[PDB]
Amino acid sequence: PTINQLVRKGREKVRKKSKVPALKGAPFRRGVCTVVRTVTPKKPNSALRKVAKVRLTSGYEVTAYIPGEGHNLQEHSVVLIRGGRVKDLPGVRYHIVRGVYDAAGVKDRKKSRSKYGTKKPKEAA
Amino acid sequence: MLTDPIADMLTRIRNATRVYKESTDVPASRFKEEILRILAREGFIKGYERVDVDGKPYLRVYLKYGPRRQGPDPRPEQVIHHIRRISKPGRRVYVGVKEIPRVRRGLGIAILSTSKGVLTDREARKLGVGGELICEVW
RNA sequence: GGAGGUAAAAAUGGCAAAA
RNA sequence: UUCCCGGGCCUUGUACACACCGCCCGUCACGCCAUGGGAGCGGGCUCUACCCGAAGUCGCCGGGAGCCUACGGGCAGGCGCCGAGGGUAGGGCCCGUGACUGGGGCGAAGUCGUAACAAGGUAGCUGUACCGGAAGGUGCGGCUGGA
RNA sequence: AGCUAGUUGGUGGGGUAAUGGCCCACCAAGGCGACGACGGGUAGCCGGUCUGAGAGGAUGGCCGGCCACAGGGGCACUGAGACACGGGCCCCACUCCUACGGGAGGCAGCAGUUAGGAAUCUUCCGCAAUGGGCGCAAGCCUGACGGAGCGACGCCGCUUGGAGGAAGAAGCCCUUCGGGGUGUAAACUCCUGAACCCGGGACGAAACCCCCGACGAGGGGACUGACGGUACCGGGGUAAUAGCGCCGGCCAACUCCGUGCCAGCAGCCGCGGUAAUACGGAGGGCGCGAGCGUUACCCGGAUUCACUGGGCGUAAAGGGCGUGUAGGCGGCCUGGGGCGUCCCAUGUGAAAGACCACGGCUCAACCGUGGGGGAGCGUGGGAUACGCUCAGGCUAGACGGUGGGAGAGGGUGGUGGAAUUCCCGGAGUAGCGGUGAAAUGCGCAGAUACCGGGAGGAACGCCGAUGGCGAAGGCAGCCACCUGGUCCACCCGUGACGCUGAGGCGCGAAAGCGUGGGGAGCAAACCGGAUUAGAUACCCGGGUAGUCCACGCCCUAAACGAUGCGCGCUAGGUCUCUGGGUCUCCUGGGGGCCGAAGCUAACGCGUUAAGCGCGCCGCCUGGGGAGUACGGCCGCAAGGC
Ligand SMILES: NC[C@@H]1O[C@H](O[C@H]2[C@@H](O)[C@H](O[C@@H]3[C@@H](O)[C@H](N)C[C@H](N)[C@H]3O[C@H]3O[C@H](CO)[C@@H](O)[C@H](O)[C@H]3N)O[C@@H]2CO)[C@H](N)[C@@H](O)[C@@H]1O
Ligand SMILES: [Mg+2]
Ligand SMILES: [Mg+2]
Ligand SMILES: [Mg+2]
Ligand SMILES: [Mg+2]
Ligand SMILES: [Mg+2]
Ligand SMILES: [Mg+2]
Ligand SMILES: [Mg+2]
Ligand SMILES: [Mg+2]
Ligand SMILES: [Mg+2]
Ligand SMILES: [Mg+2]
């Protein structure tokens, strides 16, 4: 455009949108479980991913993904929200941390224990 | 209507260098004649003279080129590779002595109009004046 | 010899996939 | 050698390229989500007009009536304007909610048809108008993104 | 998109330390706004901080400067100073004590609680330092401060040994079993010595005070340390925690087993459905280390908001076209000013931070000193090339004059023929139309085909073209009137009058709407007859609005050259339309094809640019949802912006 149009209209900034509405963008958010179930994936895959709708402290109600192998989630379990979405799951844009709440960590996990909240085992090794 | 007689003149030269014409007639004004004086000092042209066309004064500028290269596309190397007006009338550009560009790391020339006449980047840095940066040539 | 210039027919093919 | 089946060369068109046994459009059925309309209901902020209006500054009175150390003075006190705030009534914005409803997005293989892409078997697209379960069809005019 | 009652100005008062509608009476009717008032949302602002090559983008946590609040709101008193955090009065909310009538309180001070939350500490020591209030002083107060404690929260420093050591133990992993890998790694042998035990032990402290000198200068003397017996110094002395992420590509590091689109991984592309270096485990390896990852946010990459530094023929994007307001921009010459602009000096730009040197903690982090400049803004002085302004002048831009030239340019009125349909007369028969083929339909009530006459509407064959005209949509028989635009010659007059153009304004095919007129042909809808599985379609026979006129609306488009307007510049060849000439040929405008240089991603453009430049406007920023919904304006409605 011309120089004179730049002092009239000006340049517009992008002003991006948060993919995570976690109330001021807090890193974590406590919530209580209400349902614990499985949801079929998108068209290029097929499995049964374990999910849970959670009623956080902000008054909303969203779906979260349960990672790992095996868990302990019921209709009345407290849990912590991580953040990050699942590509094959529609409407699921949050993750569940494991280890310190009524949601335990993946037991019999040996490689990545920081994620999936498994504590250090000592079996003479 | 000639919104910019200076930038038009710079393109009357650019339309001639790409076809290797002997000369080009541009309209006359003393400010653009003063630009041709600096253009002959650094050696981009062979000169100019005040000619008369249809009773009106024009400036017949004698262009300068390189030697005929060997191999395909025997067009000689341009003496003037790039030339364009900086201080356009829609966007005036005024600079001091500290804000003078290193045109082609000094291999080029930055012509500018100052209070002590129209000079180039070297002598304007020596005199220490600065002003309206007209054009860059390299 | 440069233009204007000839239709009776007949639908469909599960999703996803190699250096 | 006009026609059916297969094949070779040249060319044209193409949205096809596990390549027409290709692709792809729309309605309907199911599930989830967000959003608009909606008899209305609720909430927050704000504006206007009036009624009441505490403290207090300021302005009169200080008298049939008080206290005061100098008194054609002071203090208490009475009144008046303004006034936080409360109320009554009507509006302006925003938000939540509501039976029901309109279209939309998403969801590996459900139904109905063949619209487009090969002259897609009615050249296609288009602005408008009318009709039809639906892609769509047709009328008038226009475009080459077709001969 | 309009706002304004103390709203804007005046006069006189009130009030203040002080100007002021700050407040009050009277008068005038003004003030603000696309340069974005008014309203809505959000937010303390800065030095600086983070990023970035830079320009910029983001941010305002610690420290420092300014403002504003002390549960919410108002108000004054005191006083140099307050509308006052630990002062006063009153209302609301809340807590507590009551003998019930009326009282007490205000952590956003230091700690500590509760509640919220992903999450943030000690109800510690001391006035020894520095600083503050009071006091002549002695001295008192100081949760300011100096310190200590909690927390890998961040940066920095250090440890978990070091040197030897097998042709290379055991375990474990892979194996084409011959071997290869962990791996000098361990064990083992020397040496050093974190932690710990013992002794010593501070700097921060010198003044205020006292003595001589006059309680002055000057000199001398004494007292005091929370941190803390802590740092540190000397002697002795122990082999003394390693963990986290990754290993398909981006991206550095591969083999085995398990599982079989299950379980599962995932930031993007994507892996898994029987032999997976992408899942799970094991071995090995790579990266980093008291840390390693993850999630959330900011900048980068992103030249995907492009001033540096982008684009619009076909990828998203040129407004449908024109006229024109504000605005932006402006030809050649010469003077006056010096506003932009440039230079020199001066002042300011606090300090800290940042940059560079030298130092202090045994190094660094941290800290001390010193130096160097910013940008901006105020003042004085100078320069005048360019922009700006004033004045004189010019003609190449633009406009006019004289005389011609073409054209379906527009509006109004009149008119000509051919053809279709219908009516009438004649003559004339058994079929005509229709299709790919048939049927519906018309026809012995006399059809088709032929002749003659009449009515009525619409469109103008041949000329006619790859043609012309207009700004666009668009415009075609003929005549005349009214009228616009344009081209050439002469170079006569004016003399910079110029280009673009937000808003506004006018035009705007077809379809549609209103009122009236008209209706031959055609023809949405609709009804038949065929086709087909079905036909709401293609094909056929009928057929109403509409198509046509006058006036008023609607304002869309593949409104297309999918290319905005004006000007200057860069080889030509060739077809045609239309002026002028010393009409061979030259020269001016208009429509086309091919093509130099050049541009583009290619197709392609190429003096009718998509080339090289300048001025201005519109517009684009992944696809869908969607030109949808709400709000606003327009419209009779359909609907449009
Ligand atoms: N996706 C954009 C829109 O999709 C619409 O189409 C939507 C539906 O009409 C369409 O439905 C199709 C149906 O056409 C077709 N005949 C059968 C097919 N299984 C359906 O598919 C749908 O439904 C199945 C489950 O029933 C889902 O698992 C699947 O993801 C979904 N595509 O699937 C689409 C949703 O994915 C229209 N085409 C139009 O509005 C537009 O294209
Ligand atoms: Mg240099
Ligand atoms: Mg079917
Ligand atoms: Mg698949
Ligand atoms: Mg052959
Ligand atoms: Mg072929
Ligand atoms: Mg097919
Ligand atoms: Mg008296
Ligand atoms: Mg008296
Ligand atoms: Mg509602
Ligand atoms: Mg609602």
Ligand SMILES: [Mg+2]
């Ligand atoms: Mg709904």
Ligand SMILES: [Mg+2]
């Ligand atoms: Mg399914």
Ligand SMILES: [Mg+2]
């Ligand atoms: Mg079709």
Ligand SMILES: [Mg+2]
């Ligand atoms: Mg078809």
Ligand SMILES: [Mg+2]
């Ligand atoms: Mg078709």
Ligand SMILES: [Mg+2]
């Ligand atoms: Mg149509």
Ligand SMILES: [Mg+2]
């Ligand atoms: Mg129809």
Ligand SMILES: [Mg+2]
């Ligand atoms: Mg705030």
Ligand SMILES: [Mg+2]
């Ligand atoms: Mg950058």
Ligand SMILES: [Mg+2]
């Ligand atoms: Mg409080």
Ligand SMILES: [Mg+2]
């Ligand atoms: Mg207090």
Ligand SMILES: [Mg+2]
């Ligand atoms: Mg808590």
Ligand SMILES: [Mg+2]
């Ligand atoms: Mg002290």
Ligand SMILES: [Mg+2]
């Ligand atoms: Mg003191």
Ligand SMILES: [Mg+2]
């Ligand atoms: Mg071994």
Ligand SMILES: [Mg+2]
């Ligand atoms: Mg000491």
